[PDB]
């Protein structure tokens, strides 16, 4: 068994995972290899390479992927949208009145004919 | 001024064990870098 495979398995075990599947650590190692290769190539094309080139390459890469993670207060997680824009959209939506329903239609009405699966056979 | 965990851990070389143990000296997560983001957004 290679090195850092035992370390990744120990890290997973120390976080609640009671069982694994043999091949996960290999996947993670190959992913790390590919990420390192991509970032290195980008930095080499940017500019011997300094730390500024590496930082610029990472910043450029962050523009179209890795928009996730467990970020909290003002952390770019769950898509990366800003809370003010979402609040504006929520204010716009939550301004309309709730639909009017009668007891004879409570549970039997459906959307218009344009938004239902009618005649798909 | 629980048994097999010991075997799994001791399978590692002492150098790797020391490297893992050195994590405890990290200065936790002040996340003070968020100050600039908050200032920009405020």
């Amino acid at each position: 068994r290679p090195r850092d495979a035992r370390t990744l398995e120990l890290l997973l075990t120390a976080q609640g995972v009671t069982s694994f599947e043999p091949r996960v650590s290999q996947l993670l190692l190959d992913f790390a290899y590919r990420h390192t290769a991509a970032v290195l190539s980008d930095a080499l094309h940017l500019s011997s390479i300094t730390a500024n080139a590496v930082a610029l390459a990472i910043s450029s890469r962050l523009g179209y992927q890795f928009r996730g993670g467990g970020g909290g207060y003002y952390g770019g997680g769950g898509g990366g949208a800003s809370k003010d824009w979402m609040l504006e959209l929520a204010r716009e939506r939550n301004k309309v009145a709730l639909p009017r329903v009668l007891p004879s239609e409570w549970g039997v009405r459906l959307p218009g004919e344009r938004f239902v699966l009618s005649g798909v056979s | 001024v629980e048994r097999r965990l010991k075997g799994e851990v001791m399978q590692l070389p002492a150098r790797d064990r020391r490297r893992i143990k050195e994590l405890a000296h990290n200065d936790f997560d002040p996340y003070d870098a968020l100050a600039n983001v908050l200032m920009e957004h405020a």
Partner: peptide, 27 residues
């Protein structure tokens, strides 16, 4: 000139802004 008196009600954005400003105001 004609005179008027009106009242402006609070919103959730106002509370969000208040907390955000308090977060970055030194003591």
């Amino acid at each position: 000139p004609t005179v008027y008196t009106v009242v402006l009600m609070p919103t959730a954005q106002a509370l969000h802004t208040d907390l955000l400003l308090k977060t970055v105001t030194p003591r």
